[PDB]
Scaffold this active site. Structure first.
Site, PDB file in Angstrom:
ATOM      1  N   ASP A 105       3.465  29.285  33.702  1.00 13.15           N
ATOM      2  CA  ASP A 105       3.098  28.192  32.522  1.00 13.15           C
ATOM      3  C   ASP A 105       2.619  27.298  33.165  1.00 13.15           C
ATOM      4  O   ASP A 105       2.742  25.963  33.711  1.00 13.15           O
ATOM      5  CB  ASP A 105       4.685  28.050  32.342  1.00 13.15           C
ATOM      6  CG  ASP A 105       4.269  26.761  31.623  1.00 13.15           C
ATOM      7  OD1 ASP A 105       3.235  25.886  30.858  1.00 13.15           O
ATOM      8  OD2 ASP A 105       6.016  25.860  31.138  1.00 13.15           O
TER       9      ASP A 105
ATOM     10  N   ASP B   4       9.622  31.299  31.788  1.00 10.58           N
ATOM     11  CA  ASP B   4       7.859  32.604  31.747  1.00 10.58           C
ATOM     12  C   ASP B   4       7.218  32.795  33.271  1.00 10.58           C
ATOM     13  O   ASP B   4       8.406  32.430  33.892  1.00 10.58           O
ATOM     14  CB  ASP B   4       7.162  31.315  30.749  1.00 10.58           C
ATOM     15  CG  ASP B   4       7.802  31.105  29.741  1.00 10.58           C
ATOM     16  OD1 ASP B   4       7.922  31.463  28.746  1.00 10.58           O
ATOM     17  OD2 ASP B   4       7.090  29.566  29.299  1.00 10.58           O
TER      18      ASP B   4
ATOM     19  N   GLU C 225      14.859  28.998  34.673  1.00 12.21           N
ATOM     20  CA  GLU C 225      13.270  28.889  33.372  1.00 12.21           C
ATOM     21  C   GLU C 225      12.248  29.317  34.156  1.00 12.21           C
ATOM     22  O   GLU C 225      11.934  31.365  33.985  1.00 12.21           O
ATOM     23  CB  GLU C 225      13.663  27.138  33.367  1.00 12.21           C
ATOM     24  CG  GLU C 225      13.794  27.028  32.068  1.00 12.21           C
ATOM     25  CD  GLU C 225      14.688  25.254  32.066  1.00 12.21           C
ATOM     26  OE1 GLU C 225      13.120  24.737  32.176  1.00 12.21           O
ATOM     27  OE2 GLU C 225      15.090  24.495  31.427  1.00 12.21           O
TER      28      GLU C 225
END
Ligand SMILES: [Ca+2]
Lengths: 556, 556, 556
Positions: C285, C282, C249
């Site tokens: 974040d 990302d 992620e």
């Protein structure tokens, strides 16, 4: 007896404080390791002689005492880890900020914050009398002149490192040391004295002394400070990777002027990759000479006859620093021949930068929302003849009064960015010599503008402009271009236009009465003017040969 | 026998060198810890086999010897702390800088600095013959061809870290290692060989090898260097947080070309958050191919047919680097497809940047007072087709001769700031496409200017301008605007004015003799011209339909 | 008995796991040191009680197990070094990048990468179903819903530091801890859960919790993440000096919204001096509120009535961050009143910056070749009313379609640099208020240009220009200056020239037919126009008194 031979060879040597009545007894017994495994109450000035031994001192308990615990005669390579200093006294502290982290500036409000605590504020000192005008009268006597610090003093040692230190009302002093380091400070909460000090007023100039990593909080005065250190051309000393929070004075300080009978100044140190947040005074104070009421000499240093005040060849290596939230100045220094780069200062109540420098270069500086309380005359001041190459000004704050943004009257500057009020710029020279082909893109207006302002004429009014203005509305595919000049202090008073109302012609201004001879500048040019008595345009002509003639240009 | 059972369970295991006649005897006895508690004289090539054991080696004394002390068969996770290497020989060293830290460039002056010392200078090597022309003839034989280094060699180990190493004439070599680190180097003073070397010419490409933190001083060649390392897409290797001072060659070097029978090149490494000061050659040398007299092939690497010289996909992660004081080039590299950011280079005698790159992007570069000795043709060179986005040029130094500041003939550049001489810019394309509404603010002049320069026409003369000039004096509220064009290589030769002498009219230049037909460009326009034989202005008119007519414009 | 007294005093205490059948037995015996000298298989949820002891835990072997090994009741100052976690299960992992490091976006291609390994990829999770559309249907069941992680859980401890941790399918969880640190992570390879987590959903808000240094690789979700931490005004917590590679992620995540029954949000943390490379989602974040389908409330946090969605006073200290290679967004955040500086983002497939911020300031931002796969509407988005001071746009990539580069419709921006397509800028206001005297230098063209574009009129066409054009060829010493205006959506349709063909005169455009009264703007000006029926120029004159008259200007 067989086993004891084997055991003496195969096990690591360490003594532990729980086995001795005094710290000296343990130090005397130590050979390799020393474990602090019980809290130890020391008396101020208690001095431990480590016999020149190279010791690995591992702390898992507190040193408790007001005053100094003095370590001497540690061997080069000795290391002290996890030390925790704590005062016996719980002093009165002030907390000059609100529960929304706004600074308190009113003396009475500051006095109202008084509490007895070892942290979450600091003991007032005489500098608070200046910082909070009137507070000297309003503070109760029991909150004035306090002097509580629990200090680990490393004295006259070479090659000693203190790692992961912490504490409450805590300080760390390296006095007359060389090649020593304060590494990864584990957020000690400070007392009355500086949190981390390299002081070399006696003996050889300090060298090899660093703060590397870590952070501190609170304290009455500066978080990290240096006296009489010189890193040499090798720049072997200074402060790298450090964070200071809520210094009662400044985050990082190189001392100025005479202390005792000699110089407290510093040369050839690194100040890099570090952050100072919410100091009561300054973020970084890297000056060497006294600004206000200075000494007439520099005992122990270069004389004024060799280097004038503020023009010492300090030669620090200064790069990649961040300051936010100062109640004083974000970044201050002096010196001549300095190079400074990549400094970012935000949200300071006093000047973002106060630079008593000469023949120095500042590259990629950002000063963003500073002097927010109008404490100083400007956001960035430079006294001497310096160069600034890249200067970001203005964040989101407005300025209501008349203070300048940059006042650098002897400096040459290029590369300003931001929504600066141009009337608040004062420099010797401002220029963009090396731009490419340019486009001015305008948003939120019916026109685009390229303006000119001659500060000698007016700092507040543009003297001429090149505009493009919409004809009709959006999507018309039509605009007019306008070339203007100021007259009678009225911007854009006189203008030539091209394509006004999509007419495809040039609108040409003419002299509204009989033009005087001197009105025309150049040969082979004409100047139209009005002759009201005949309803005619005339032309004042300077012929190719330079002689003047008057002609009829347009008639009824 | 009861106690021995308990003791074997409750005490930390460590052996110490004071109990053994050789280092191998101690290594053999060790299980967990090994303490170096006496100085140890080693012979060059002395090799210690650590039996695959995961050892924590704590050094509190010196390893003394010329040549290499070779550590082998250390278990993954082994750590060596505080190591101090020292040569037996005190060689002859040169010190090519003055007591004011000015570089010496004259060979005879350099020779005069000769002294026997283990530090404060370096042993000459063959590269000094190039750096100081004539020195080869002038050096005494006893100062040529010396080869003194005391080197800790970690050989064919995985997962070994050397922490807080130091020394005199000292080097650190990781040969055929992986996942090894040189951490927090404690300013070793270098010898003849590189101070810190990761060399993987044999076996698998090196990976996981880092220099993290710390600093070095002196040495005859480069401070930190890599041969045949590839960090993978994970960028698992390189150099972060490091300082190099006074390298005899370069601060940080990735080798180029063939060494032995194979490639010495490097891929996918990090070079970040680091500083190089006062190298005799270069700050960072991140090239992979030989510039001068290159190999026709790359044994062990990609062939020239796949990637031409200087166009390897090196893919290093390069960010936040500072160089000051190089006698050579501050920052050099080659490669294709590179991204490079946040580089700051100041006060170098050769080029600030020498970039043999293609299809690469450089963001936020500052090159401030470089090529100060005119050693190279320019301050920043770029050979290939690259993009530069943000380039600060010029500090406080002047340039007396004709050298270029940037020569990047195939590159497209935007965002130059600084007092650059525009005649010293050479790029493929220079543009500011995205500026907003603009204001030109002028200080120290009676006018403000927006100038245009077409480099194809002249690199030295502006071809046209938009000026605003004061009428009268300061505070007049009056200026004139002027639109100019060059003629006969005389800037501003022809001009139109608006409001000269506050006359409120436009002064219009006219053709000083009979205008030729081709003088007029566009339809529905007129061009005034002089008819001396009647003292009349005429107009050459291109009518809306494109046909020409000549009219009388102004008459006596 | 004499020796035992002496031995107990002079040796360092450490127990070692090889002497005990369980980790609890060793923990119970420990007093100072604890050595992990054999691999230890733990069961998920196995819990060790360290008795409040201040232990120095030195790891030289593996903890092997799926699930959590839970450490409790460690004394303040405890340290765990060298820990290595490894799963028992070898799961199925995907590797969505090629051998040339290009991202795979096609679900079928991603499925084809499946292999059983503890590293070099990650276990799919539900977010992959969104990231790679269609993959949910194509993944084999044995590759869906896997849950393999070997996690060291530090539970409800204060003052514990984990140093140099590593592993395979490894995680590190600090649950309900304060003043804890994850220091110099030695590139653990992640599993299903976050690699480094500070989670404080129960008890007091987390404070004093940091990631300092080190790096991680892989993992299915985010590399480093925080839930319900607040560093206080002292900013005592966050992430400094860290590198994340190939997060499944995001590299660094502050959680958003409600988790369980309370807030997962974070305040007053540092995010500095760090790098995120090749995250699947990302880079950073740093948002606190849910963007898509948000909660109507914030249990445990400030209510929506006090701070609207995305307008929390998060007050993080954010500086000096680098992101390269994201498949999602490089840098994302929300909040009101934020200051953000020195962010560099390169080569991202989604937006370089996605900023749901209001009344915030962004200084020295560089967004270089992002949105390369057109995943978002733009390269940098800002929703609210913010200020940007210094914004570098465009590296070397082109954009084929119609996406914007910056869309910041409520923001005021200054200091854009780069080869941006001006039609792809959308801001509230764009301005360079504080430039000095200017020069436009043109390379590779026969002209130089200063263009104006009124975005309200047209975002794609310049509305007027100031040009300088070569007359003849290079070296002529002659150019003409041209002032233009757009008409009928044809740039440069109408123009005035000075010195065309070196004629030394001004070419003046006239209205091609009878000028209407309203065509003239200002008093004391004239507008030439064409009278075809007499082959005459006329002048529409607005006299000094404002009244109109029509005159004959030029005649046959
Ligand atoms: Ca006439």
């Amino acid at each position: 007896d067989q086993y004891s031979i084997e055991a003496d060879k195969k096990f690591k040597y360490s003594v532990k404080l729980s086995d001795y009545p005094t710290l000296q007894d343990a130090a005397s017994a130590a050979v390799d390791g020393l474990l602090i495994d019980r809290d130890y109450n020391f008396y101020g000035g208690e001095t431990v002689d480590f016999g020149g031994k190279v010791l690995t001192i591992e702390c898992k308990a507190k040193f408790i005492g007001d005053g100094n615990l003095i370590f001497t005669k540690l061997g080069k390579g000795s290391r002290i880890a996890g030390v925790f200093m704590e005062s016996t006294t719980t002093p009165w502290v002030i907390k000059p900020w609100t529960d929304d982290n706004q600074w308190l500036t009113d003396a009475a409000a500051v006095v109202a914050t008084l509490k007895q605590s070892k942290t979450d504020g600091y003991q007032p000192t005489v500098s608070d009398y200046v910082k909070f005008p009137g507070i000297e009268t309003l503070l109760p006597p029991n909150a004035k002149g306090q002097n509580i610090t629990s200090t680990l003093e490393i004295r006259e040692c070479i090659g000693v490192e203190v790692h992961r230190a912490s504490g409450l009302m805590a300080g760390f002093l390296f006095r007359g040391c060389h090649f020593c380091k304060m590494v990864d400070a584990n957020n000690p909460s400070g007392g009355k004295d500086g949190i981390i000090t390299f002081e070399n007023l006696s003996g050889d100039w300090g060298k090899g002394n660093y703060v590397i990593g870590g952070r501190t909080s609170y304290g009455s005065v500066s978080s990290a400070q240096f006296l009489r250190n010189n890193g040499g051309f090798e720049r072997d000393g200074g402060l790298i990777g450090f964070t200071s929070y809520r210094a009662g004075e400044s985050g990082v300080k190189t001392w100025q002027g005479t202390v005792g009978s000699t110089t407290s100044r510093n040369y050839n140190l690194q100040f890099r990759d570090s952050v100072v947040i919410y100091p009561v005074w300054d973020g970084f104070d890297l000056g060497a000479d006294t600004d206000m009421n200075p000494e007439l000499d520099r005992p122990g240093d270069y004389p004024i006859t060799q280097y004038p005040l503020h023009q010492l060849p300090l030669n620090h290596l200064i790069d990649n620093l961040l300051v936010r939230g100062a109640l004083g100045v974000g970044f201050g220094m002096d010196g001549k021949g300095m190079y400074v780069s990549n400094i970012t200062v935000e949200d300071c109540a006093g000047s973002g930068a106060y630079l008593l420098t000469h023949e120095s270069v500042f590259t990629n500086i950002a000063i963003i929302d500073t002097n927010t309380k109008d404490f100083q005359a400007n956001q960035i001041y430079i006294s001497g003849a310096c160069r600034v190459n890249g200067l970001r000004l203005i964040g989101i704050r407005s300025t209501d009064g008349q203070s300048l943004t940059i006042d650098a009257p002897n400096s040459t500057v290029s590369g300003i960015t931001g929504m600066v009020d141009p009337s608040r710029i004062n420099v010797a020279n401002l220029a963009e010599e090396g731009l490419g082909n340019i486009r001015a893109n305008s948003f939120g207006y019916d026109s685009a503008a390229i303006k000119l302002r001659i500060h000698k004429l007016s700092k507040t009014l543009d003297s001429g402009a090149l505009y493009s203005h919409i004809n009709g509305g959006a999507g018309s595919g039509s605009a007019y271009t306008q070339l203007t000049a100021i007259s009678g202090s009225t911007p854009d008073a006189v203008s030539l236009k091209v394509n006004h109302k999509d007419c495809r012609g040039a609108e040409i201004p003419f002299v509204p009465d009989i033009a005087s001879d001197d009105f025309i500048k150049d040969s082979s040019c004409f100047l139209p003017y009005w002759e009201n008595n005949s309803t005619s345009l005339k032309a004042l002509v300077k012929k190719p040969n330079g002689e003047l003639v008057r002609l009829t240009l347009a008639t009824l």
